[PDB]
C-alpha cells in the first residue's frame, strides 16, 4: 500500500517532469519582442497610481513573491482565482490560446524563467504593455488614449496625463467579465472598480483626497 501512493507520486513527478520539458520552450526573451511595440511605455515611466492600480486590485504583493503566490494559489485552490502579475504575463504572451491543467502547470514552470531572468520593472512592463482592455487595445498607452484621450506617460507634455479613477477603469477591465464594457459601464463593473479605488486607498497608492476625487468622479 505505501508503494501504490509512491507509484502515484513518481508519475506525477513523471508528469511534472513531463510539463517541465514542454515549457521549453517558449522562451524568453521573446517576451523582450513586446517593447517594440508602437504605444510601449515602461512602467517606471508610469505614475505610482497607475503602477498600484494594477499591483492593488490583481497582484496585490508583486515585488515580493519570485513568479508564484501561494496565499493567491490558495485562494483560488479554493481555501476562498488569481494569477501573478507574472503568471499572467506569460500566460497572455505564449498561453493567450489554451487553458488546460497541463497548461497551467507548466505556466508555473515558464514563469520561474521570467522572474530569474527578468527584473520586476521589466516584468510589470509586460504585463501592462500586453493586455486586453476590450476594444482591441492591449497596450496601456493605446487604452488610455483610446477610451480618455489621456496619457500614462509620467514625462508626457503633449497629451494630458491620466486620472486616478481612470486608472481603476482600465486595471478592472483587465479581468472583468467580456460584459464588461468601459464605453458604458455596469452598476456591477462601476461597483468593480470601487473595490479597486479602495484597494489602492487601503494600500497608499494614493489618499483620501485623490480617492474620493475618483468616487465622485465615478458617481457623476
Not at 25 to 38: A, F, M, P, W
Not at 132 to 139: A, H, I, R
Not at 148 to 157: A, L, P, Q, R
Not at 175 to 183: D, G, K, L
Given at each position: 500500500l505505501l508503494k501504490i501512493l509512491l507509484t502515484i507520486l513518481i508519475i506525477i513527478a513523471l508528469f511534472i517532469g513531463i510539463m517541465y520539458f514542454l515549457s521549453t520552450?517558449?522562451?524568453?526573451?521573446?517576451?523582450?519582442?513586446?517593447?517594440?511595440?508602437?504605444s510601449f511605455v515602461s512602467a517606471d515611466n508610469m505614475p505610482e497610481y497607475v503602477k498600484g492600480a494594477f499591483i492593488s486590485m490583481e497582484d496585490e504583493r508583486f515585488y515580493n513573491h519570485?513568479?508564484?503566490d501561494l496565499k493567491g494559489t490558495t485562494r483560488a485552490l479554493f481555501s476562498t482565482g488569481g494569477s501573478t502579475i507574472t503568471q499572467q504575463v506569460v500566460k497572455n504572451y505564449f498561453y493567450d490560446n489554451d487553458r488546460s491543467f497541463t497548461r497551467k502547470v507548466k505556466e508555473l514552470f515558464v514563469a520561474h524563467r521570467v522572474e530569474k531572468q527578468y527584473n520586476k520593472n521589466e516584468i510589470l512592463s509586460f504585463y501592462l504593455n500586453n493586455i486586453?482592455?476590450?476594444?482591441?487595445?492591449?497596450?496601456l498607452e493605446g487604452a488610455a488614449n483610446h477610451y480618455?484621450?489621456?496619457?500614462?506617460?509620467?514625462?508626457?507634455?503633449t497629451m494630458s496625463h491620466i486620472t486616478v479613477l481612470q486608472s481603476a477603469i482600465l486595471a478592472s477591465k483587465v479581468?472583468?467579465?467580456?460584459?464588461?464594457?468601459?464605453?458604458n459601464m455596469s452598476e456591477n463593473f462601476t461597483q468593480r472598480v470601487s473595490t479597486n479605488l479602495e484597494k489602492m486607498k487601503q494600500q497608499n497608492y494614493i489618499n483620501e483626497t485623490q480617492y474620493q476625487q475618483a468616487m465622485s468622479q465615478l458617481n457623476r
Open positions: 520552450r517558449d522562451n524568453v526573451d521573446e517576451l523582450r519582442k513586446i517593447e517594440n511595440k508602437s519570485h513568479g508564484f486586453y482592455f476590450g476594444d482591441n487595445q492591449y497596450t480618455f484621450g489621456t496619457t500614462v506617460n509620467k514625462n508626457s507634455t479581468n472583468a467579465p467580456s460584459v464588461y464594457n468601459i464605453n
